[PDB]
Design an enzyme around this catalytic site. Structure first.
Site, PDB file in Angstrom:
ATOM      1  N   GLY A 180     -12.970  -6.180 -25.985  1.00 14.14           N
ATOM      2  CA  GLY A 180     -14.134  -5.726 -25.229  1.00 14.14           C
ATOM      3  C   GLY A 180     -13.782  -5.646 -23.736  1.00 14.14           C
ATOM      4  O   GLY A 180     -14.409  -4.891 -22.964  1.00 14.14           O
TER       5      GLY A 180
ATOM      6  N   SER B 230      -5.101  -3.634 -20.271  1.00 14.22           N
ATOM      7  CA  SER B 230      -4.573  -2.973 -21.440  1.00 14.22           C
ATOM      8  C   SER B 230      -4.591  -3.876 -22.679  1.00 14.22           C
ATOM      9  O   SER B 230      -5.134  -3.507 -23.718  1.00 14.22           O
ATOM     10  CB  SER B 230      -3.177  -2.415 -21.166  1.00 14.22           C
ATOM     11  OG  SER B 230      -2.595  -1.860 -22.342  1.00 14.22           O
TER      12      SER B 230
ATOM     13  N   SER C 281     -10.879  -4.514 -22.541  1.00  9.38           N
ATOM     14  CA  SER C 281     -10.008  -3.329 -22.297  1.00  9.38           C
ATOM     15  C   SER C 281     -10.595  -2.413 -21.242  1.00  9.38           C
ATOM     16  O   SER C 281     -11.795  -2.164 -21.225  1.00  9.38           O
ATOM     17  CB  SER C 281      -9.821  -2.519 -23.572  1.00  9.38           C
ATOM     18  OG  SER C 281      -8.689  -2.947 -24.280  1.00  9.38           O
TER      19      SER C 281
END
EC number: 3.4.21.81
Lengths: 185, 51
Positions: free
Chosen positions: A139, A156, A141
């Site tokens: 979540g 990432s 990212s």
């Protein structure tokens, strides 16, 4: 809406990285693995508030994507939560950084290495990544990695978690800004 | 979901939840599969979505 806030695609949830602009056109950056195969983005799980549409996506190899705002009323803050962002900079080993994400909120740490290669498997290899000792969880990212008022990178992935501690890799934001001809504000 | 290609040293951090047999919601397939490997194959998929 600002850096670190949740964003929803047809597939799942990621986090908004940084609000950026080119001339009078507003966009937001996020992770490439989130923009990959996504068209429309919404501000809520109900998918009632539209944000915009994917304008570019680069993953694997790199890990950045950009979304063009189509929502004309939503506020587009040039901040990360309440933190103002005024410029972008390159990461350096030993740099103190902070990440904000939609699942774990705000966590801090330091840059431990540069130009790292991360193999997510199945041919999804990303290069030139910033390695840190900051945690991140699903979540998070695409959320921003910043240092004071400086934008540094986009979340990432990595390993571990926020309870036990972890290692998270970030895509340098400078590269994304350059690729799309946009700038933070 | 197939975890034979695991474990993996790193996972991307997008949220697409799965519910494991330990009643824990796993954030994404990569996280779930690494947990299966770590459990030495004892953990299984209960259902898709949050527990």
């Amino acid at each position: 809406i600002s850096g670190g806030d949740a964003i929803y695609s047809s597939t799942g949830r990621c986090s908004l990285g940084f609000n950026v602009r080119s001339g009078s056109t507003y966009y937001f950056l996020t992770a490439g693995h989130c923009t990959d195969g996504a068209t429309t983005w919404w501000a809520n799980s109900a998918r009632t508030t539209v944000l915009g549409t994917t304008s570019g996506s680069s993953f694997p190899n790199n890990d950045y994507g950009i979304v063009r705002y189509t929502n004309t009323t939503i506020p587009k803050d040039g901040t990360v939560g309440g933190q103002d962002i005024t410029s972008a900079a390159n990461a350096t080993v030993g740099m103190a950084v902070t990440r904000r994400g939609s699942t774990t909120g705000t966590h801090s740490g330091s840059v431990t290495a540069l130009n790292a290669t991360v193999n997510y498997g199945g041919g999804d290899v990303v290069y030139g990544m910033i390695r840190t000792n900051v945690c991140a969880e699903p979540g998070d990212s695409g959320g921003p990695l910043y240092s004071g008022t400086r934008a540094i990178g986009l979340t990432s992935g990595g390993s571990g978690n926020c309870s036990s501690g972890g290692t998270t890799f970030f895509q340098p934001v400078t590269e994304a800004l350059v690729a799309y001809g946009v700038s933070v504000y | 979901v197939d975890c034979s290609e695991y474990p993996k040293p790193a996972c991307t951090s997008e949220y697409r939840p799965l519910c494991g047999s330990d009643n824990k919601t796993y954030g994404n397939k990569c996280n779930f599969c690494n947990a299966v490997v770590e459990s030495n194959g004892t953990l299984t998929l209960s259902h898709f979505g949050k527990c």
